[PDB]
Amino acid sequence: DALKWSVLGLLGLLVGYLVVLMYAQGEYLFAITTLILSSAGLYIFANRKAYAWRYVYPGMAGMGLFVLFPLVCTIAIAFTNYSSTNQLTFERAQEVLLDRSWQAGKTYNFGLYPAGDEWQLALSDGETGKNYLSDAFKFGGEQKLQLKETTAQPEGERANLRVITQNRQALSDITAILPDGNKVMMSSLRQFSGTQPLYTLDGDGTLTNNQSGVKYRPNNQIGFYQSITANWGDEKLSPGYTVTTGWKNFTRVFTDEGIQKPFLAIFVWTVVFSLITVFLTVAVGMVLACLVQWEALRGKAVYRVLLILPYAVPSFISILIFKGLFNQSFGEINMMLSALFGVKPAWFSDPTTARTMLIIVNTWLGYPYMMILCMGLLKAIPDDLYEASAMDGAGPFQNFFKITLPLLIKPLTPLMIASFAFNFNNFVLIQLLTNGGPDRLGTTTPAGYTDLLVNYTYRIAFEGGGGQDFGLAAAIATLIFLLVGALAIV
C-alpha cells in the first residue's frame, strides 16, 4: 500500500466503461444515476478530504437506491393513471392492438409433403370437400404459391409435427393462394386460413379497423385509443395505456362525499391504535428487559429466549390462529372465560371490544421488538449509578422511574415515533383478523370500525370494483405519509 490513485484510476475506468455503455441502448435513468453516485463516491475519497462523508455515503447509497428511489417512483406514478386499465405503455398498447388478429376466410387443415429435396403444401376445405395442392417449393423468405384443385394424393408421406415446427419460420412467410383467388396465410401448426390484421396504423399515427372501417386516434387525456368521426368518437378500445394525469386522483381524494365521510373517525382510531400499541409495547418490553438482567433472577437465560418467540415465528400464521382463539362462540379463549368467569366476550361483533382484541394481539406481536431493543440499550447505563441509587436508599421501583426509565426515553423516542408510523399503517394485522369488522353502517364506501386509514384506502383503490387503481393508491400513500410526517414532527 502506498497511493490510492492507482485504485481510483482503475475505478475511474469502470465508471465510464459502464456509464457510456448505459448511455447507449437507451437506459438513460440508469446512466444518469450511476454517474452522480460514482461522482459523489469518488469525490469524497479523493483530493477534497470529506472524511465524514466516507462513513455516511456507503450507507446513503443503499438507502437512496433501495428506499429513496422507491419513493420518488411511487410519487411519480401518483401523477398518472397507471392501473389495471391503463396498465401498458402507449407503445405496448399499440403493439398489442397491431397484433390483434381477425379471421375473414376459412380454416383449411394443411399438410406438408416432401417432393425429393423440395416440399409441397396441401389444403383441405372443411366444406365443399375440395382438396388443393401447390407446386414443389423450397423454404426461406416470403413467397406466394398457387394452389390447384387436386383430386389425387401427393407422393411422399405427410411430415411430422417436428418437421412442420422446425420449419415454422419459413412456413409462416408463405402466403398460399387458392384457384378461386383468395389469399390464405398460416394461422396454426395445423391450419392455413384467411386471418388478417384487425388494425393498420397510419404514418400520421391514426389506427384504422380493417373490418368495420372505424378510425381511431390516441386520447392522451384519458389514456385510450378513442374513435374518431369527421372530432370524437364515442368508442374506446382496450387495453388502454398509462399517461400523465397531473393533480388528478390527488384532487379526487378531496372531493367525494362518501370517501371523505368516515375519514375523520378512522383517523382517530389509527392514532389511538398505534399510540396505545407503542405505549404497551414499550411498557411491557422495558419491564421485561429489566427483569431479565436482574442477575438475582435465576434461570433468566431461559426466560430471555421464551419471551422472544412471539417474534421468532412469522406474523402471518400467528395472527391467523389468534383469529381462531378469539372466536366469539368457539375458540379456546372464550372456552375458559365461560368456564371460570361468566361473560363470553364478543371480540368481532362489538366494535369497542374488537378494537381491544387488536391491541392485545399487537402487544403480543410487538413487545419482543422493544425488549430486544431495551436489552442492549439498558447496558448503556453504568452499574455505579445504581450503586449511587442504593446509597440514597432506592430500588427497585424507585430505581426504575428515577434512573432506568428516564435514562432510556431519549434514545428510545425515535424508535417509538417510528413505531407509531409503522402501526399507523399496519395493514397486514387488520385484514387478517377483521376487514374493519364490524361494519360502520351507512357508509356508501366500504368502511368498518376496525379499519385503519390504510385498510379503508386499499379497498377504495384496489377493491370496490373499477379494477386495481395503482395511480389512486400511490396518491393516497403520499397524502397519509405527508399527514403522518407532519404529525410526527409535531
Binding site: 450503586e387 441509587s389 442504593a390 446509597m391 436508599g393
Partner: protein, 372 residues
C-alpha cells in the same frame, strides 16, 4: 449505628483482598481508614455498604446482621472514590435525591440543599449538569448528596482528594462540625495524613487486606505495632537502619550501627524476647532527628537531595556504609548544596526498634499525648 465487623473476609476467587478483619466501630465514633493504594479500603467500605459481598465472616450494623441485606435498606450513604453523579440530573437534583426519595416537602428539601451547597461553595453551580463541572467540583457534589441525605452511617471514600490546600482545610472543618452536630457514625477513607490525625477518634491502618493496627492518632505515631505502621504513618517516611543487638538489659536494648563510627546505644525498649546478635531494624523519624551539635550520638554523611518546601528544608543524607538515604527535617530555609558534608544527632529516647519478623518492641519512653 454501631457498625462492627467480625472476621470479615473477601476473596475474588483466588485474590484475597481482605483477611478475617476485626473492627468494632462504636456509635458516634469518627473512624478513618488508612493504607497503601491497593490494600482494600474501598473493599472494606463497600462491604459495609452492601455494594460488595462478604465471602466469610459477620457484619453487624446496630442490632442487625447486614451480610445478606440489600444496600438501600442498610440506612447508609456513601460518597464514592469515583463520584457516580447522576448525569441526567443537575447539581440541585443530585443533592436533593436521597431525601426526595425517603422523605418529602419541597420547602424542606430546597432549604437544606442551599444550606449544604453554601458550605461546599456550590451555590452558583446549582443548575449545572455534572459534565459541565470540574473534577473537584463534582467531588463536592458527591459529598453534598450524602450530607443532605443525613444517613444513619456516613461512609466517605477519599472525599477531599481533588481539592486545593485551602478548601481541603475548610471542608475538613465542615466535616468535623457535622460529626459533632449529628453524632452519626462516620467511616472515612483518606491518603492525607493531616485529615487522618485531625478528624479521627480512631485510625485503622490496613496492610494487604489484613488490619495492621487500630488506635488513636498519636498512639499510632508514637507507638506503632510493627515496621509497617511505623513506615506508613509520618509525612516523609521514618528512617530505617540495620542494627546489631550487642547486649540486652532489663528495660534497655543495646545496638550498634554498621559503619566506622562504632557507637553503641541503649534504647528504652520492651526488651522482652530479643535475640542477641540477631539483625534488627532501628526506626527514627526525620522530625525527631536533632542537629549534630546538640546530641551525643552522631551520624555523619553526604547530602544527596535538598528539597526546599519554604516552611522547612528536607535533606537526604547518605551514611558511609548504609543501603538507603537518611531523610532529615529542619525548620525554615536551610542553604545546603548537593554533595556537602552533613551531620545529625540521633536521640535514643525517640527511637523505634523492630524484630526480624517486623513486629515492634514497645517504646517504654513516655510521650506526650498518649495515656498509658
Amino acid at each position: 449505628a454501631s457498625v462492627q465487623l467480625q472476621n470479615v473476609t473477601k476473596a475474588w476467587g483466588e485474590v484475597v483482598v481482605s483477611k478475617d478483619i476485626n473492627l468494632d466501630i462504636h456509635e458516634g465514633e469518627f473512624v478513618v481508614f488508612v493504607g497503601p493504594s491497593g490494600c482494600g479500603k474501598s473493599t472494606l467500605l463497600r462491604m459495609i455498604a452492601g455494594l460488595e459481598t462478604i465471602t466469610s465472616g459477620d457484619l453487624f450494623i446496630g442490632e442487625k446482621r447486614m451480610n445478606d441485606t440489600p444496600p438501600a435498606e442498610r440506612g447508609v450513604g456513601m460518597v464514592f472514590q469515583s463520584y457516580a453523579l447522576y448525569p441526567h440530573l443537575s447539581v440541585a437534583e443530585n443533592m436533593s435525591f436521597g431525601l426526595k426519595l425517603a422523605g418529602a416537602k419541597k420547602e424542606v428539601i430546597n432549604q437544606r440543599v442551599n444550606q449544604v451547597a453554601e458550605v461546599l461553595q456550590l451555590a452558583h453551580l446549582l443548575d449545572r449538569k455534572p459534565k459541565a463541572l470540574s473534577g473537584g467540583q463534582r467531588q463536592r457534589v458527591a459529598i453534598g448528596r450524602t450530607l443532605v441525605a443525613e444517613p444513619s452511617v456516613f461512609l466517605l471514600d477519599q472525599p477531599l482528594s481533588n481539592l486545593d490546600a485551602a478548601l481541603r482545610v475548610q471542608m475538613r472543618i465542615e466535616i468535623s462540625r457535622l460529626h459533632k452536630r449529628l453524632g452519626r457514625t462516620m467511616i472515612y477513607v483518606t491518603h492525607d495524613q493531616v485529615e487522618a490525625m485531625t478528624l479521627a477518634d480512631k485510625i485503622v491502618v490496613l496492610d494487604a487486606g489484613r488490619v495492621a493496627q487500630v488506635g488513636k492518632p498519636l498512639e499510632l505515631y508514637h507507638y506503632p505495632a510493627d515496621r509497617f505502621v511505623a513506615g506508613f504513618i509520618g509525612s516523609p517516611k521514618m528512617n530505617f537502619l540495620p542494627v546489631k543487638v550487642t547486649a540486652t538489659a532489663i528495660d534497655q536494648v543495646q545496638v550498634e550501627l554498621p559503619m566506622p563510627n562504632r557507637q553503641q546505644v541503649w534504647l528504652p525498649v520492651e526488651s522482652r524476647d530479643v535475640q542477641v546478635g540477631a539483625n534488627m531494624s532501628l526506626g527514627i523519624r526525620p522530625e525527631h532527628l536533632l542537629p549534630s551539635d546538640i546530641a551525643d550520638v552522631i551520624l555523619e554523611g553526604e547530602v544527596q537531595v535538598v528539597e526546599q518546601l519554604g516552611n522547612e528544608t528536607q535533606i537526604h543524607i547518605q551514611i558511609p556504609s548504609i543501603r538507603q538515604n537518611l531523610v532529615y527535617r529542619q525548620n525554615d530555609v536551610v542553604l545546603v548544596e548537593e554533595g556537602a558534608t552533613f551531620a545529625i544527632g540521633l536521640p535514643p529516647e525517640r527511637c523505634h526498634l523492630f524484630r526480624e519478623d517486623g513486629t515492634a518492641c514497645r517504646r517504654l519512653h513516655k510521650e506526650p499525648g498518649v495515656a498509658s
